[PDB]
Design a protein around this ligand. Structure first.
Ligand SMILES: NC(=O)C1=CN([C@@H]2O[C@H](COP(=O)(O)OP(=O)(O)OC[C@H]3O[C@@H](n4cnc5c(N)ncnc54)[C@H](OP(=O)(O)O)[C@@H]3O)[C@@H](O)[C@H]2O)C=CC1
Ligand SMILES: NC(=O)C1=CN([C@@H]2O[C@H](COP(=O)(O)OP(=O)(O)OC[C@H]3O[C@@H](n4cnc5c(N)ncnc54)[C@H](OP(=O)(O)O)[C@@H]3O)[C@@H](O)[C@H]2O)C=CC1
Ligand SMILES: NC(=O)C1=CN([C@@H]2O[C@H](COP(=O)(O)OP(=O)(O)OC[C@H]3O[C@@H](n4cnc5c(N)ncnc54)[C@H](OP(=O)(O)O)[C@@H]3O)[C@@H](O)[C@H]2O)C=CC1
Ligand SMILES: NC(=O)C1=CN([C@@H]2O[C@H](COP(=O)(O)OP(=O)(O)OC[C@H]3O[C@@H](n4cnc5c(N)ncnc54)[C@H](OP(=O)(O)O)[C@@H]3O)[C@@H](O)[C@H]2O)C=CC1
Lengths: 381, 381, 381, 381
């Protein structure tokens, strides 16, 4: 009965020790510089604070219209003041080699714009969701990327969230069986007094109501969970005509879709009901419930069968995977380096916009809108 | 300190004691006698077994077309062999004073016929859902009910399930705020080898597919959870064309509704995916999640707000309320003894059938169907 | 495609059909007749109500000291008024061939007496736990059982509860790995105003405090979850000195054990805190959490590993196994009919009593008590 | 029906916007510099990466024995290489005004040492748990802090974890009622091959087994949950004599405690069973279950009562509170600035060590160890 060699071989005095075991993502290099456009809610609450956890990304320069603020932010994240661009001279970034790409976090209407401008600035483009307010504008963004021979990546963080990935994997391993019915719901009360929620009420900047903003989650979700595209869609929308919030954009809208596989889906988004992010995938062996489904934190999934409910969630002491944000940032830096295609290409953001427009059309005409245009997902969902 | 009077006064020898505290519904009488029509799957697995927990009901007679089976069930439940009736001599129950009501648990297309025959036989009628296969038939049952001056109740067990009533209660107390979105799903894999599912695949006997069989739960649930009736419905249905199960009845169907209050809903029923009974009611203050929502056992409900999930389910040592089956059985009994209306009258059953026809009609035409026809829930939801 | 033979062959008119699929335990016979001794809280809330789901048992006679109460319960359960016995003429059951066994549900201190009298009366015996108030008395019951060549079973409902048996099963399949720590807690607020709790505060009638009443669950549970017996016990007990409830029996007691395999355990019982029934079994591969663990209803179990929580509980539409109450009742019946031993023989009851005395002794002396006395669970845990 | 002023007043063109709403901790100043000693597992996996989220803390200098490593780390976190101290010249830090305090994250045996040395270096001391390997050594650490007129803060992160705080609050608001039984368990398999787990096996560096390392959580927990100190304690320990891991330190140990309030507790820690962090507090109105109880992430709490389970956890889109780590770091920086006493003073770390030694004694002698020495918690628990 004797103690292990390693143990007994430890200096009962101050001594140097080896690299400890990594039970969570350790910082590596920082060879990718980002140009963050629009210092808004998402940019300052979830994106910037998510760089610290990156393994290959850094905030090289900011791009804000507000000076007082922009300077303050630059301090908190320690960015060279001489590198605080704006909407006027955003193009000058092409004169800095330390700017590998830009991350546009502006209202949907301004997405396409600064993307193309950025592409000519010889930088990679990471644009937020939804890609743009126009199908065509999405296409122009792509073309620009190809002309400038650069990478185009939309901000689909759920494509890099551990639980969402585990969700796709269990479904690919056929744990639910033959897929037949998906149900999604994404909701949160619209606050008109919130600076970030105002341009969302404006059909010009937003490009749509809840669907364009959060219903896109269920739409996108339904797509990568099923692992295929809708071939047909129907939809109905409605908003309280007395509510000033939805004069231009829609509050609630419900869409039904069919897939070549034969599977059906029905989901909805809302601006008048509180926090809801719930996905449901039904197969003939089991049903998957993701609730939370697409949150920033605390996502939880469960596979249910009579008498059983197997749940998954981030461990309580370890982090076998990085958070969606950092993972997303380093996903571009990583696609550039090893010269690989991104999982969230502009081609993907475009597909969502078409389908959304197809939906709005269905809601407008009250007829089904054929969406069998032959889109193909590059690199699987 | 010393022992209280209660304990100090307990004899140490064998002695009679008081009535004990009741922590569950105790039996009381067996005044109300039923005649069960149709010894099938629901009857033998749920209803018959349900008479034990009743406080006022008993099984007096059986009505089957399978003598071999009747004698067996009859002996299993201590029913008098003389009280076995077949479908042709069914009407003679009018001669038995000890038969107060019948419980029709026959295929949907046969409900009307026996309800009517039972009324002419001068008996009260409990009839399973769907009420019937035609709106008109629901009316003939109601008319016949009014002619015999007897009561007509449709078997909506969920109207007597502790958790459902609790979900209704917290909603009416405005714990969710203004209601805006309601989602429902009800699915279970159809197995044509099961004797009970065989007539369910026959349009002539079933009246319809998954909506008629289990979608009705999401429908009815949506109505008593909101406490209002829909003014219009839209819907789409699809069934694999090569699946022999759905030659005559629909497999999956999706339907969405709008209510006079402005709230919306979207639900689905399915015969090709595994067990699913789930309701969510989004308010602008909180969200109610019922999952399981309409199970025979283990219903569970959750009120969710960012950071919280207050769950409710049956206690583990006490039974505050009787089970839905026993309650439903005693509800008719009590309403007859105290001369009161039933919470689930034929009018209610008829309203579901009418709505179901509108949904099919809407699925069929691919157009909206106005259902704003002035149905008024007598006695509340 | 076309409809399968099954469906296409369903008559459209009233017709007898097959026996239905069974999704829950169906009644079969009522061969085994019991005589219930002691119409108290457990008898009237759980056991009597439990005879309905039995497949082989029935209530033939009642034994009470409160005639007014006996006639009422007798009428409630269709028992023959002639079959009511008081405590003095109890022995005459020997004259009734239709009485196969007795179910003693009297205060703990009176179990031995009636078990013995019942055996001399030539009947089988079901006796509640604690088996008795003295080790010696457990033996006299066993000896008397052997003399009448009749069976003796202690009422350990948990030995017939689907979830408990499931927890045992996953453990024996090594899903937790080598077991090392087991925690148990069983608590419920003692209310001396309740007639049933009155004798529980009398050392002479109860035999002990919370350990004898509900701690026994953690104890017994610990034993069948590990599948082995403890070799030594240590314990401490404390009760507010000014609380009239605990003048003679203990309120809270904590006890820890060591098993021949090396595993340890620490549990507690309590009469002054609210409802608690929780077991955790830590292995080096996973952890089992039973909560509720020993409830009358809604037991729930969870196997936990970093990032997962696989839960199990009764299904919502099917009843794979009969409830613990009905099962326990039929277990004795079956064992008599098929000439087999019972899973819960007096030896098992006696082992708990012996262990309980060791725990009290250990609490009293503040010293360890060796319990390595060679008890062997016949038939497995 | 017209759109809100704020909305309509947004430039459909690139425009500067105001500071967005903060739905999570925003970075403020960075006026507090930390000196991190020992670049081990905890230091590089949970502490350093937690500085980024601070509001007033920064990593000014490192103190490692290993040079190659230390330099690498310094890069990742961007620290001035010229500021990479070591165990030889750790004292020179007194020559740098930008070092406001040191954070000792060395083996327990080396805690007291570098603390006092640090205090004479005119810096504040943040020492990890357990405070030290000697009661006396704890006292010397305090004295040094008072002599150098500095602040002494132990690393009790659970004192700064949102859920743990919510736990204390609900208990203070009397939601559980009168507290009477606490149950804790802290376990994780010991990996001898893990560089960080080796000195823990050495009684000289560790100062104890699981209790000193993780059982301290349940001990500490029991204390701040109850909000009072134990007046008496008993304990038993045991380890498989064949396991090489526990030749010196103990694997498992179970302790029972009593409080002046009259409340009782029983908890345990383990090195041979997998991940377990579960606290249970029983009152006469409700029971609180914390599971996870003290994890790095995903903590969850539930208040249970018959039929109900109200759960709390971090929201899925917002962060109303900072993580325990950052919160802990900024807690010192904040106590220094506004000149306020820390909630985790050396006086607190000392109390735990005494109690632990008192426990080990109880486990050693097998007798109860009186702990009524009159400790008083400064600033509440
Ligand atoms: N994937 C996800 O989870 C989420 C994605 N998003 C997306 O991020 C993008 C930004 O929206 P969000 O941060 O919420 O909103 P905000 O209103 O808070 O910020 C918009 C930012 O864009 C700039 N901007 C330029 N022109 C305008 C204009 N005319 N009106 C308003 N802002 C302007 C501003 O930068 P500055 O003031 O500094 O000059 C401002 O900070 C959207 O495309 C949104 O869909 C949002 C939330 C989550
Ligand atoms: N509320 C609820 O939760 C549920 C309600 N139900 C309802 O109960 C009713 C019966 O359905 P269910 O028990 O599942 O089905 P079953 O097929 O198992 O039984 C139907 C019964 O009615 C009698 N019957 C008479 N003529 C026919 C016929 N031509 N074809 C089939 N059966 C006939 C038979 O009884 P016998 O052999 O003795 O003559 C048969 O057992 C339906 O209206 C259904 O909607 C069903 C499930 C759940
Ligand atoms: N396995 C389980 O889950 C449970 C088992 N039990 C066990 O059941 C047995 C009865 O307890 P419980 O039903 O709770 O208690 P009760 O006090 O409610 O009833 C005891 C019954 O025994 C009879 N009795 C005869 N003499 C006495 C006496 N001197 N004092 C009190 N009662 C007397 C009475 O019946 P009558 O009036 O008709 O003469 C009385 O109703 C106990 O041994 C207990 O441990 C209890 C709860 C749960
Ligand atoms: N509150 C909490 O949640 C936790 C607190 N801790 C505490 O943190 C402290 C550090 O332990 P932990 O990080 O897990 O362990 P590690 O073994 O991984 O690291 C110990 C560090 O201390 C230094 N050190 C100096 N002398 C020695 C020595 N003789 N043997 C080993 N290391 C030495 C080393 O620094 P370098 O190699 O760089 O020279 C080494 O990096 C402990 O007091 C522990 O209790 C640990 C986990 C969680």
């Amino acid at each position: 009965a004797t103690l292990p060699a390693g143990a007994s071989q430890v200096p009962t005095t101050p001594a140097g020790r080896p690299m400890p075991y990594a039970i969570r993502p350790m910082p590596e290099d920082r060879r990718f510089g980002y140009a963050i456009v629009g210092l808004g809610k998402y940019a300052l609450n979830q994106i910037l604070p998510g760089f610290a956890g990156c393994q290959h990304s850094r905030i090289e320069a900011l791009v804000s219209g507000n000076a007082e603020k922009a300077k303050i932010v630059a301090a908190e994240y320690g960015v060279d003041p001489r590198k605080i661009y704006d909407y006027s001279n955003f193009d000058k970034i092409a004169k800095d080699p330390k700017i590998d790409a830009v991350y546009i976090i502006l209202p949907n209407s301004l997405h396409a714009e600064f993307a193309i401008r950025a592409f000519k600035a010889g930088k990679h483009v990471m644009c937020e969701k939804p890609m743009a307010t126009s199908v065509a504008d999405c296409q122009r963004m792509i073309d620009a990327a190809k002309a400038a021979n650069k990478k185009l990546m939309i901000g689909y963080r759920c494509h890099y969230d551990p639980m969402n990935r585990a969700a796709v994997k269990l479904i690919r391993e056929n744990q639910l069986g033959k897929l037949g019915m998906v149900t999604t719901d994404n909701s949160d009360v619209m606050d008109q007094n919130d600076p970030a929620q105002q341009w969302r009420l404006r059909r010009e900047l937003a490009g749509g109501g809840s669907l364009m903003d959060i219903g896109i989650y269920g739409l996108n979700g339904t797509r990568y969970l099923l692992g295929e595209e809708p071939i047909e869609v129907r939809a109905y929308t409605y908003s309280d005509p007395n509510d000033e919030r939805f004069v231009e954009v829609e509050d609630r809208i419900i869409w039904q879709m069919r897939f070549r596989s034969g599977a059906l889906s029905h989901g909805a988004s809302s601006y008048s009901t509180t926090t809801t992010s719930r996905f449901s995938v039904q197969g003939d062996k089991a049903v998957l419930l993701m609730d939370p489904a697409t949150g920033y934190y605390q996502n939880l999934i469960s596979v249910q069968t009579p008498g059983h409910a197997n749940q998954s969630m981030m461990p309580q002491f370890i982090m076998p995977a990085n958070n969606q944000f950092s993972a997303q940032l380093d996903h571009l830096a990583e696609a550039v380096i090893n010269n690989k295609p991104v999982r969230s290409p502009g081609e993907e953001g475009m597909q969502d916009v078409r389908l959304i427009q197809a939906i709005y059309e269905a809601a407008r005409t009250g007829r089904p809108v054929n969406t069998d245009w032959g889109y193909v997902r590059q690199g699987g969902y």
